[PDB]
Design a protein around this ligand. Structure first.
Ligand SMILES: *[C@@H]1O[C@H](CO)[C@@H](O[C@@H]2O[C@H](CO)[C@@H](O)[C@H](O)[C@H]2NC(C)=O)[C@H](O)[C@H]1NC(C)=O
Ligand SMILES: *[C@@H]1O[C@H](CO)[C@@H](O[C@@H]2O[C@H](CO)[C@@H](O)[C@H](O)[C@H]2NC(C)=O)[C@H](O)[C@H]1NC(C)=O
Ligand SMILES: *[C@@H]1O[C@H](CO)[C@@H](O[C@@H]2O[C@H](CO)[C@@H](O)[C@H](O)[C@H]2NC(C)=O)[C@H](O)[C@H]1NC(C)=O
Ligand SMILES: *[C@@H]1O[C@H](CO)[C@@H](O[C@@H]2O[C@H](CO)[C@@H](O)[C@H](O)[C@H]2NC(C)=O)[C@H](O)[C@H]1NC(C)=O
Ligand SMILES: *[C@@H]1O[C@H](CO)[C@@H](O[C@@H]2O[C@H](CO)[C@@H](O)[C@H](O)[C@H]2NC(C)=O)[C@H](O)[C@H]1NC(C)=O
Ligand SMILES: *[C@@H]1O[C@H](CO)[C@@H](O[C@@H]2O[C@H](CO)[C@@H](O)[C@H](O)[C@H]2NC(C)=O)[C@H](O)[C@H]1NC(C)=O
Ligand SMILES: *[C@@H]1O[C@H](CO)[C@@H](O[C@@H]2O[C@H](CO)[C@@H](O)[C@H](O)[C@H]2NC(C)=O)[C@H](O)[C@H]1NC(C)=O
Ligand SMILES: *[C@@H]1O[C@H](CO)[C@@H](O)[C@H](O)[C@H]1NC(C)=O
Lengths: 133, 49, 171, 197, 49, 37
């Protein structure tokens, strides 16, 4: 029995690790028979603070990291008489009396479609010329 | 089975007890004629803005 | 419906709206834990302050955690927590990180930014006396480090008075 | 070698595909009408009551389309915010060096390279990380001839017997001289003064 | 009774959809605020801005 | 393109995106940060 309900099939342990499957209220589970425990924030150390002592590095390393950022998605357009009527005269006549609903949908879709292209252009077009190595 | 489209020849194989097939989202893709018993193919004819 | 077979059967032919609603709710529930993780989990290790407290005259006793309290929260944290103030098919899920872990993260950050400065934000924490970290920090705003060493006591007194005033205003 | 490193773009593509797929799937629903196909109910019932079924189908499909449009708008706003952040990062980290902490990678920023991706960008950040520290001993200022000396740029250290001036981010001791120190007042107010030459 | 059941069902479904949309908007705003807070903590606490 | 749904191609093809990326990279390798101002 935990604070988020209860688990069946898992065995509680007294240890603590940087877990991978969240459960809730601090409790989380892992495989290692499935076990459940309390997650550990990390290794604990104490810096030897004083009032006349420092720590100056003597060597260095250079690391290259990566990050990924999406910029745009697919541009889509949707018809109405094809979709909600499927080329039927009676359906078209009945739909005709619902005012102008599809115009707003087409306008919004066109707006987002233009926004995607403007977004990509502003993201990538940062130079005025084309340099060559 | 009623609907519009263009009919072409298809090489897909049907088990001897089916009558028509579909791919996904329950949309007809191929049909077998009840007379000559051959597998045709249905394609929506072109449209656009 | 509320435990009605006829209502469920009638709703069964309305499509898959409910799956979409549940998916959206689950996504916005996960987003909160993601936000907390990205805002608080900023340190790889958990630092702790040395037992002997002499930061050149500065007094941090009101923000550092107090082991006497069971919650291990400082005075300002308790003031903030005290300041801020049934079943029909809807439930409330508990957060993944409880208050104690958040307090531990805040204490680790506050203890790492005092002893080491900004060094622990790039690599490993490097010890340095506080009175010299402050002199470095004046040197970054156009004022020479000369100024601090002739006005250490006055600056410490002003800082203590300011933090006491903040505590009184919050209380 | 390792997969699952591009989760964001794959998630975006999967979300778009799933939304389109469920929008298409919504056609087959009944919405309480007699049937999900217009031709059958048209050829099976005369207009006077068939119009009710047509209206039910029309309103159901319209509601589904409206929901899809709203979801698309939300995702478009999210993507716009993300790409604005990406453009800011491109402007600040590729066209020049950055001083703000942790904006581009971990450690002290050096430079960056952009690369394309099917619906996004990939930044490679080259940074600088120190290591192999020591302990030493420190004093804030040095009193000579009664007057206090402070370092121009660096810090005082000592290897146990002799005092040196170094820079903060790298160990390179030098002999203390008038050329890298400046004098201000007398050694009576600073707390930590040490006697030396 | 099916007419009344349908009326109640559609009304409650509409209310639920409205609530979900409002929750989505509020969640987006909260996410923006959280991003701002994370940036502030990264810049002003771990260094001098 | 099944029953009224159309996917519009992007304005910028992948080749020109690659050319933009190559131009940026060749500019930053050779000139540094001066080519941005
Ligand atoms: C620097 O001096 C300290 C003592 O002033 C050395 O001892 C370390 O002290 C801290 C905190 O008490 C412990 O966590 C370490 O395990 C100690 N190191 C040992 C015992 O080897 C410290 O080693 C010295 N060197 C460095 C790089 O800190
Ligand atoms: C700083 O670190 C680098 C990398 O670890 C050291 O370079 C290595 O030195 C060892 C011993 O001379 C060699 O066996 C390795 O091949 C070197 N690595 C590379 C990539 O060249 C360097 O010696 C360290 N600096 C100091 C002062 O010890
Ligand atoms: C159903 O379709 C026709 C109906 O007559 C028949 O199939 C062909 O019929 C023509 C003329 O009647 C013959 O010349 C062909 O040789 C027939 N083909 C085959 C394969 O039988 C037959 O009655 C039925 N055919 C099938 C395939 O079920
Ligand atoms: C830091 O400030 C706290 C808060 O004022 C000081 O704690 C006070 O100490 C006095 C003297 O012992 C007591 O009379 C008060 O009751 C304490 N206040 C609280 C809230 O406990 C503390 O002494 C200060 N530390 C330094 C080094 O000046
Ligand atoms: C601290 O550094 C100084 C500067 O090099 C050392 O002084 C010289 O050290 C070398 C080798 O250690 C000797 O050959 C010289 O005779 C020393 N000269 C003087 C004027 O002292 C000093 O030995 C270092 N001390 C320690 C404890 O490492
Ligand atoms: C750094 O801290 C040490 C430890 O408190 C200080 O050394 C004390 O200095 C006082 C005043 O001279 C003496 O009464 C104590 O006996 C000293 N303690 C020890 C263990 O030596 C030292 O003065 C501090 N350095 C400063 C303030 O610059
Ligand atoms: C640094 O040197 C000065 C000058 O020699 C010292 O100041 C005087 O030193 C003599 C000899 O020890 C004492 O008799 C005087 O009482 C000192 N006067 C004052 C005002 O302090 C000073 O003590 C030395 N400091 C250190 C830390 O060595
Ligand atoms: C350890 O586990 C046992 C049961 O496995 C439990 O009774 C006990 O409370 C746990 N903690 C300690 C400190 O023993």
């Amino acid at each position: 029995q935990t604070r988020a309900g209860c688990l069946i099939g898992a065995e509680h342990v007294n240890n603590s690790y940087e877990c991978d499957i969240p459960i809730g209220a601090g409790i989380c589970a892992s495989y290692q028979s499935i076990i459940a425990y309390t997650m550990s924030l990390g290794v604990e150390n104490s810096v030897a603070y004083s009032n006349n002592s420092i720590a100056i590095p003597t060597n260095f390393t250079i690391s290259v990291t990566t990050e990924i950022l999406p910029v745009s998605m697919t541009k889509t357009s949707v018809d109405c008489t094809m979709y909600i009527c499927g080329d039927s005269t009676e359906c078209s006549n009945l739909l005709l009396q619902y005012g102008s609903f599809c115009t707003q949908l087409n306008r919004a879709l066109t707006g987002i479609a233009v926004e995607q292209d403007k977004n990509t252009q502003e993201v990538f077009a940062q130079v005025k010329q084309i340099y060559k190595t | 089975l009623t609907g519009t489209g263009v009919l072409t020849e298809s090489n897909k194989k049907f088990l001897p007890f089916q009558q028509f097939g579909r791919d996904i989202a329950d949309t007809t893709d191929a049909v077998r004629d009840p007379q000559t018993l051959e597998i045709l193919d249905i394609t929506p004819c072109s449209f656009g803005g | 419906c509320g435990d009605s077979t006829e209502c469920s059967n009638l709703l069964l032919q309305y499509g898959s709206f409910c799956t979409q609603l549940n998916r959206a709710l689950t996504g916005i529930a996960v987003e909160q834990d993601k936000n907390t993780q990205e805002v608080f989990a900023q340190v790889k290790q958990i630092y702790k302050t040395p037992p002997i407290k002499d930061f050149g005259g500065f007094n941090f006793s009101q923000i550092l955690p107090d082991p006497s309290k069971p919650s291990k929260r400082s005075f300002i944290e308790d003031l903030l927590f005290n300041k801020v103030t049934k079943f029909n098919g809807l439930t409330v899920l508990p957060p993944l990180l409880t208050d104690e872990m958040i307090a531990q993260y805040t204490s680790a950050l506050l203890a790492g930014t005092i002893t080491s400065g900004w060094t622990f934000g790039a690599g490993a924490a490097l010890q340095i006396p506080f009175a010299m970290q402050m002199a470095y920090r004046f040197n970054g705003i156009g004022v020479t480090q000369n100024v601090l060493y002739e006005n250490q006591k006055l600056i410490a007194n002003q800082f203590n008075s300011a933090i006491g005033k903040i505590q009184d205003s919050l209380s | 070698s390792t997969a699952s490193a591009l989760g964001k773009l794959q998630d975006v593509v999967n979300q778009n595909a799933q939304a389109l797929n469920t929008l298409v799937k919504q056609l087959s629903s009944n919405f309480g009408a007699i049937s999900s196909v217009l031709n059958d109910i048209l050829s099976r019932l005369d207009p006077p009551e068939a119009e009710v079924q047509i209206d039910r189908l029309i309103t159901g499909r319209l509601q589904s389309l409206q929901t899809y449009v709203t979801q698309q708008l939300i995702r478009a706003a999210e993507i716009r915010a993300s790409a604005n952040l990406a453009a800011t990062k491109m402007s600040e980290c590729v066209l020049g060096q950055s001083k703000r902490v942790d904006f581009c990678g971990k450690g002290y920023h050096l430079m960056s390279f952009p690369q394309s991706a099917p619906h996004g960008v990939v930044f490679l950040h080259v940074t600088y990380v120190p290591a192999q520290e020591k302990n030493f001993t420190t004093a804030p200022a040095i009193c000579h001839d009664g007057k206090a000396h402070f370092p121009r740029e660096g810090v005082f250290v000592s290897n146990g017997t002799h005092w040196f001036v170094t820079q903060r981010n790298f160990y390179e001791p030098q002999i203390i001289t008038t050329d890298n120190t400046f004098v201000s007042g007398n050694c009576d107010v600073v707390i930590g003064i040490v006697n030396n030459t």
